[PDB]
Structures are given as C-alpha cells and as structure tokens.
Design a protein around this ligand. Structure first.
Ligand SMILES: Cc1cc2nc3c(=O)[nH]c(=O)nc-3n(C[C@H](O)[C@H](O)[C@H](O)COP(=O)(O)O)c2cc1C
Ligand SMILES: O=c1cc[nH]c(=O)[nH]1
Length: 338
C-alpha cells in the first residue's frame, strides 16, 4: 500500500516544455476541476509548488504562476477529504505569517493542511525582487531553514515563540488559533544537508523519480533518506515524483511521448541551464499502457523508503480520469480503496 498525490499545475503547461504538449494557463477553476477529480478517485493529497519566475520561450514556460498558499486555501474550501499542501518559499514570507496562514487553512480544510518548506534554489526568483541573501546562501540555506522551522514549531505547538538566532528574533511572538491537528511539514531535500533537515523536522521527504520506465532507479536516493532518518530515530518516508504518460497500449503511449519530445521548446530549455528528456525537466517518466503503468507503479511501492508517489500527467483532466478508471484498479498497492 502506497499513497498517491497530484502535483497541481500552478504554472502554465504543467510539466511539459513542448509546442506539442497541451497548452493551458493555470487558473483556479482548472486546479479546482483537477483536485476535485483527484479526490473523487481517492488520491491522498495535492501539492502545489511556488515558482516566482518563468523560463520564457515559444511556450512562455512558467511565466504564468498563481501563488501557492492562496491557491490551496481556495482548493481547501471546495474539497472535503484530500490532504492539501502549499509550498512556502522561505525567503519570501516571515515564519509567523506562514504559521498563521497554515492555521487559517487548517480552519478552512478542517485539519487537512500541511506545508512544504523550500530554501529556494533559483537565484533569479529572489534577485528579481532584491531579496537574495548573497552567495553565502547556497552553503547556509539549511541553517536558515532550521531557524525558520523552529519558529513555526513554537507557534504551532504552544501559540508563542521567544526564539532568537542569527536570522530571526521573536519577542513573545503570538499566533492563535493553533492548528486543529498536528501540522505536517514536508521537505524536498536531495542533498546531505537537505535530508538531515528532513530527518529532523519533516513528516516526509519528496524526491525525484529517475529515468524513463526505470521505476526503481531512484532507490539509492530513498536509501540515503532512510539512512538519514535512522540518525534521528524518526519515521520520514520518501514520496517520489513521476510523470505518467499512459494510453490503451504501449505503442500509443510511446507515440504521445515521442510526439512531445519532437515539439521540445529549446528556447525555454536553454534558460533551465531510452533517455530522460528535458521536455519535462528530465523527470522520472512512466510511459505505457494502463496495465504497464500500474505494474511499474507497483514496483515503486516495493522500494525501501518509498511511501508514496507524486504524479504529474501530460494532460491533467483526462490523465487523472484514466489513472482513476484504468490504472489504479490494477494496482496491488491500492487494493485497499473502495
Ligand atoms: C516534489 C518536489 C517539489 C518541489 N517544489 C519546489 C518549489 O515549490 N519551489 C522551489 O524553489 N523548489 C522546489 N523543489 C526543489 C527542491 O527543493 C530540490 O530538490 C532541492 O532544492 C535540491 O535539494 P537540496 O535543497 O537538498 O539541494 C521541489 C522538489 C521536489 C522533489
Ligand atoms: O522548482 C521546481 C518545481 C518543480 N519541479 C522542479 O524540478 N523544480
């Protein structure tokens, strides 16, 4: 048994950088239709990223992005079962605001909300608004996040923080109400420091799936995450990001995938700088018939450490539909559902 989440397209064209991919703006209403459909098929959770700058090109890839906390507050108000995670880009929001936003969406969702904390990698995302802390930051970002999360822990735990460190000073800082349920914190650290951070403070860790149709290729990463979690004695499983390109037969899925790679938007792709393709940022990709994708996802579920998968689709509305109608009923690790 394995948890499934949907990575909601808060950015235009989702995760495909291609003139042959579906072209779409991220709107509330689309994300709404996506999450209500995921929920209908008993997806366990929905997460949006935050992305403050695009990559340009013919497709203007990720030039158009909604903001994660307000989007997930809206989706919380129109759902009732699915878990909801927003991403805080920690350089952009003071911890006490994040603490109170999380409490607010706790209230909207009736205890279904959590937070994905990220340090921020993309210097231009922060440079553009004059808030990059210098090149000190690459090396020091995990100390920063350590202080940040301590402030949140105090606020969610007791309503109050006196935390004092290098980057934050609380003087009897107050946030009430406190979340109705223990606030879940997720992290996406791949590095050593990142995994050490997650081992100490996260409920689980997002990592990248690897290769095309090589479902268990990420297994070493999940092994290191599991090793990091032994060092704190805490249960911090891996959730693995894959793109699913599924169809009636393997041939048809492969034709879609090739069709996408053909239209690659090379102009957008320069700004980012059986093989994985940059057309989906070299994402772990599963391409096949419904049954073949079911089988490969079953393999992911057997990797030590792996507690779930976070899924993108080439086409979200019909991809979630076919996943739910054709893939999920064939998956051993989902036989527990209605
Ligand atoms: C599921 C997933 C979601 C992510 N979401 C974001 C995001 O919203 N914003 C962002 O700047 N980075 C995001 N990242 C990038 C990660 O934080 C990245 O793995 C990390 O920066 C590299 O690991 P390190 O920080 O330990 O070096 C995401 C990564 C994964 C795997
Ligand atoms: O910043 C981001 C968001 C989604 N996927 C990535 O690889 N990076």
């Amino acid at each position: 048994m394995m948890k499934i989440g949907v990575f909601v397209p808060i950015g235009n064209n989702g995760w495909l950088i291609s003139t042959h991919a579906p072209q779409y703006m991220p709107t509330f209403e689309l994300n709404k239709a996506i999450v209500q459909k995921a929920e209908h098929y008993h997806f366990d959770f929905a997460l949006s990223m935050i992305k403050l700058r695009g990559f340009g090109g013919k497709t203007e890839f990720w030039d158009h992005n909604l903001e994660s906390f307000t989007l997930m507050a809206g989706l919380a108000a129109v759902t009732s079962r699915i878990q909801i995670y927003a991403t805080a880009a920690t350089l952009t929001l003071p911890p006490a605001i994040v603490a109170r936003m999380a409490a607010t969406i706790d209230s909207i969702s009736g205890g279904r909300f959590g937070v994905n904390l990220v340090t921020g990698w993309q210097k231009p995302e922060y440079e553009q608004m004059g808030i990059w802390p210098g090149d000190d930051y690459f090396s020091r970002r995990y100390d920063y996040l350590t202080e940040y999360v301590q402030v949140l822990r105090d606020l969610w735990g007791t309503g109050k923080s006196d935390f004092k460190g290098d980057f934050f000073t609380m003087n009897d800082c107050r946030v009430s109400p406190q979340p109705s349920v223990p606030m879940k914190v997720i992290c996406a650290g791949q590095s050593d420091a990142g995994m050490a951070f997650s081992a100490r403070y996260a409920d689980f860790n997002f990592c990248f799936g690897k290769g095309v149709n090589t479902p268990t290729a990420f297994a070493p990463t999940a092994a290191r995450m599991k090793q990091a979690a032994e060092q704190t004695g805490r249960d911090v499983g891996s959730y693995v990001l894959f793109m699913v390109i599924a169809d009636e037969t393997d041939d048809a899925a492969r034709a879609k995938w090739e069709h996408y790679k053909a239209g690659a938007d090379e102009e957008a792709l320069s700004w980012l700088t059986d093989p994985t393709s940059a057309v989906n940022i070299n994402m772990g990709t599963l391409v096949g018939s419904y049954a073949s994708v079911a089988r490969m996802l079953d393999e992911v579920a057997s990797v030590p450490g792996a507690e779930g998968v976070l899924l993108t689709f080439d086409d979200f509305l019909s991809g979630i539909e076919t996943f739910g109608e054709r893939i999920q009923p064939l998956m051993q690790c989902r036989a527990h559902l209605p």
